[PDB]
């Protein structure tokens, strides 16, 4: 209660595949969709659609940002309960070149 629940309890978005908190993003939706939660470094850009007759995309793996790009993949995000200072710690460690991979159990 004292060092989490009453101080900086935030529920963040964590990719289950890369294990990172900072590189997630709520997607700018196509106008007929819902803004979902997507990870950025697991995501591959939609122009990388390089080529059983073909390897076409299942149309729900593609999301956009406010710049206007498109990205395939980057899903498989979940919500965990962290202190917010863990989100600030991970930004101070990236600036040193160090990533923190989080291993999240329901996979």
Partner 1 sequence: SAAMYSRFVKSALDDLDKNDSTQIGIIANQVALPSKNPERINDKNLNILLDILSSNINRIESSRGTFLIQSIINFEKWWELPPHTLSKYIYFIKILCSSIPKWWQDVSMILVSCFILPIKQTVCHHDMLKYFLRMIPSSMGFIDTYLAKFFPNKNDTRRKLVNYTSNLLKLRGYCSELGFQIWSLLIEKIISIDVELQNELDELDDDVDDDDLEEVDLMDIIEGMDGTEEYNVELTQGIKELSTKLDSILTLVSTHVEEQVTPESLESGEGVGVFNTLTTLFKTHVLPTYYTRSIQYIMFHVSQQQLELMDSFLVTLIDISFAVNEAAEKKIKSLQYLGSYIARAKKLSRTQIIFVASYLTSWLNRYVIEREEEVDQRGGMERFKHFYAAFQALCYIFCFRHNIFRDTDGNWECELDKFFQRMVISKFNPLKFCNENVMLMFARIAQQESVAYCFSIIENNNNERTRQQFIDLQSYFPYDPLFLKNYKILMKEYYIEWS
Partner 2 sequence: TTCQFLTKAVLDNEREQLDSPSARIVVGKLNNVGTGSFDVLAKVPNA
Partner 3 sequence: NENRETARFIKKHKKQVTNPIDEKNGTSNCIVRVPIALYVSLAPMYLENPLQGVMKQHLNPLVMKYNNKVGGVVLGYEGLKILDADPLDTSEKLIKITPDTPFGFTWCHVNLYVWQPQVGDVLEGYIFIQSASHIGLLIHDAFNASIKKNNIPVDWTFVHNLGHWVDSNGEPIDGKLRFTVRNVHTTGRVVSVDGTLIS
Residues forming contacts to partner 1 in the complex (CB under 8 A) are 31-33
Q: Supply the DSSP symbol for 20.
A: -
Q: Supply the DSSP symbol for 88.
A: H
Sign of CA dihedral 62, 66, 68, 71: negative
- How many whole angstroms separate alpha carbon 100 and alpha carbon 21? 9
Residues paired with 72 in a beta bridge: 44, 62
User: 23-82: which residues touch partner 3 (CB under 8 A)?
Assistant: 30, 32-34, 44, 50, 52-53, 55-61, 73, 75, 81
- Report the residue from 28, 36, 86, 94 that binds partner 2 according to the rule CB under 8 A: 86
Work out what residue 86 binds among Zn ion, partner 2, partner 3, none; the CB cut-off runs from 5 to 8 Å by kind: partner 2
Task: State the residues that interact with partner 3 by CB under 8 A.
Answer: 5, 30, 32-34, 44, 50, 52-53, 55-61, 73, 75, 81, 106
């Amino acid at each position: 209660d004292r060092l989490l629940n009453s101080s900086d309890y935030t529920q963040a978005s964590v990719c289950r595949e890369c294990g990172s908190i900072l590189t997630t993003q709520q997607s700018v939706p196509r106008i007929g969709s819902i803004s979902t939660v997507c990870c950025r470094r697991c995501s591959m850009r939609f122009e990388d659609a390089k080529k059983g007759e073909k390897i076409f995309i299942d149309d729900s793996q593609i999301w956009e940002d406010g710049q206007g790009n498109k990205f395939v993949g980057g899903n498989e995000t979940t919500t965990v309960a962290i202190p917010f200072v863990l989100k600030y710690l991970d930004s101070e460690l990236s600036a040193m070149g160090i990533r923190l991979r989080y291993n999240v159990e329901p996979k």
